[PDB]
Design a protein around this ligand. Sequence first.
Ligand SMILES: [Zn+2]
Ligand SMILES: [Zn+2]
Ligand SMILES: [Zn+2]
Length: 85
Amino acid sequence: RPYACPVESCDRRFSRSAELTRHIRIHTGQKPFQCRICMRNFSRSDHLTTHIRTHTGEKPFACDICGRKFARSDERKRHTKIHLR
DNA sequence: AGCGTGGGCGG
DNA sequence: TCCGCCCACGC
Ligand SMILES: [Zn+2]
Ligand SMILES: [Zn+2]
Ligand SMILES: [Zn+2]
């Protein structure tokens, strides 16, 4: 944790600089990635990608048990667990 | 469910 | 640094 957050009202520390730079955007309100379709801005590129799937209906992740598809891998992970009970 | 969004991290 | 995952938590 050699990269602490300078903003006085915040107590965060990071292992890498790349993360402090990304984290700083929370305080600056910096939203660099815009959606062509709805023009909404996002703080992260990876979140813009998944958001875009809400428009196209793209669902790359299918459940191994029932085949139900989802836009994100975490949605599928949360789902598969329901086949236990 | 649907999906916003930050942290850790490998490349 | 960026990229783009996993992972996690929120409403
Ligand atoms: Zn901060
Ligand atoms: Zn959009
Ligand atoms: Zn299933």
